[PDB]
Design a protein around this ligand. Sequence first.
Ligand SMILES: Cc1cc2nc3c(=O)[nH]c(=O)nc-3n(C[C@H](O)[C@H](O)[C@H](O)COP(=O)(O)OP(=O)(O)OC[C@H]3O[C@@H](n4cnc5c(N)ncnc54)[C@H](O)[C@@H]3O)c2cc1C
Ligand SMILES: O=C1NCc2c1c1c3ccccc3[nH]c1c1[nH]c3ccccc3c21
Ligand SMILES: [Cl-]
Length: 512
Amino acid sequence: MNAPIETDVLILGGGPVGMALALDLAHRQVGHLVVEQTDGTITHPRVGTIGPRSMELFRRWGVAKQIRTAGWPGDHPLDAAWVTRVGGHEVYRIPLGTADTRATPEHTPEPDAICPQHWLAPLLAEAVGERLRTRSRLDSFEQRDDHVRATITDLRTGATRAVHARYLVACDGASSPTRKALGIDAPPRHRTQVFRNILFRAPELRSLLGERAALFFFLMLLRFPLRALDGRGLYRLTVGVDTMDSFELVRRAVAFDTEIEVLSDSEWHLTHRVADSFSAGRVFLTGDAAHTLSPSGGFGMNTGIGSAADLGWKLAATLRGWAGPGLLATYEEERRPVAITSLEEANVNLRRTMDRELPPGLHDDGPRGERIRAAVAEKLERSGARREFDAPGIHFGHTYRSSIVCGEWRPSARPGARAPHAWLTPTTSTLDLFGRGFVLLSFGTTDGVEAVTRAFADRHVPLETVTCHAPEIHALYERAHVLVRPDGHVAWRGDHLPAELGGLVDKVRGAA
Ligand SMILES: Cc1cc2nc3c(=O)[nH]c(=O)nc-3n(C[C@H](O)[C@H](O)[C@H](O)COP(=O)(O)OP(=O)(O)OC[C@H]3O[C@@H](n4cnc5c(N)ncnc54)[C@H](O)[C@@H]3O)c2cc1C
Ligand SMILES: O=C1NCc2c1c1c3ccccc3[nH]c1c1[nH]c3ccccc3c21
Ligand SMILES: [Cl-]
């Protein structure tokens, strides 16, 4: 006869986002538990590209190294190429080097990475440990005044147990049963696109392609993308449906006569949706459950991870007791607008490919087809197609303009924006200073800092003060004092600390 289990945060869903939230909560020493209905095994990778901002967060949570050393070949091309057929005529290619050779980015200590879900999942599961309960399905929940009660069914054995948690964070996906149960709607913002995904293994295809290999192959037969999943034989063909045999589809897209074994052929319905509300009482929505966006630019999962990181610190602060009563509401305040708009940027990338048409003689071998291909190439570059593969602003430019920020692409320390990266040492970035409590960076004068420290202490708001004597970084941040939030974003800056510190403290913690 087992009794109710107690934990501060119960995370519903062990997908990438739910795991990201668990990592942040562990990093902040908040008791939590993750319940995942499946056994946690991946049979058909849905994600693989990890944006630089997400990698910075994985760096913070201590798993960035293993993600990078998970198995993506250091010498595999990262290029994006528009081709009339893989192995056939090439139309346009965006060179992106290789993991081992590309220049270290100047704006971030962590460039993007490739980690197919079948590697990421075990890796995330390993980092979350025993707090991840697989084959566990949350059947129902009931909110009470100071906690939420959930009934969990052990799908391995068959026994049902109850979990009493202070907060339930639903990371249960795009069709979020939890969102429905809360009576919150997520009205479509664009027509539902139905995609057919064919996961196949072609052991010798990379050898046949060689340097002509690519991470992304945008075919133009009739038009769709083919991806190198693990850079080791596993590929994924994505074709829009709006019906040939799975094997015959791949065969048509690949001009080579090589071993091709289709492993999976499932369907995917993408419906750009954003919840009208990101929470009800003590129940929260994160990831696709809160906002489903288009995968263009890997924008979807990266936004979920960023939203998970935002809710993580606001939850910790409230559980700790130093947060104002209105801090948790700022999760929706700051993250929904990121979805409401940012879901549009992904859509633009989808539209550009959905609208591109193909002319006659594009497959020809004569100098004519080579000329018409060069024609489409020019158009492609003009339509800004290389923007879906290079948009730092999209990964790092989101600036919060909220009730807890004191308002006043290139890295900027303006209030609301991500505090910029700069190397302290060859291994330590300004980013490595953020992630715990608030951080006050002072460039030069330390006059007035003791006042800030006391103001934060009077409210029990964690604050770490750092004096920096580096002009290059001071120039970068543009002000003498910069107050950074637990999430790495600037809450306030200025050459002179404000007069009413109590006001500042109550505002940034969501008490004002
Ligand atoms: C068939 C399919 C194909 C896709 N293809 C692509 C693609 O090609 N590119 C792309 O960018 N994105 C793709 N996606 C979307 C991508 O997987 C998500 O955007 C991403 O992983 C976001 O993660 P999430 O963590 O919010 O939720 P999800 O990854 O959707 O995970 C939700 C988790 O909740 C668990 N869960 C649900 N209900 C319960 C319960 N009652 N109790 C316990 N656990 C529960 C699930 O088992 C699951 O593991 C696809 C999705 C599907 C369904
Ligand atoms: O993961 C994906 N799954 C589908 C996808 C993905 C990605 C994707 C993933 C990471 C980075 C850029 C990306 N662009 C696209 C994409 N551009 C497209 C155009 C038409 C139809 C589908 C896509 C597409
Ligand atoms: Cl509480």
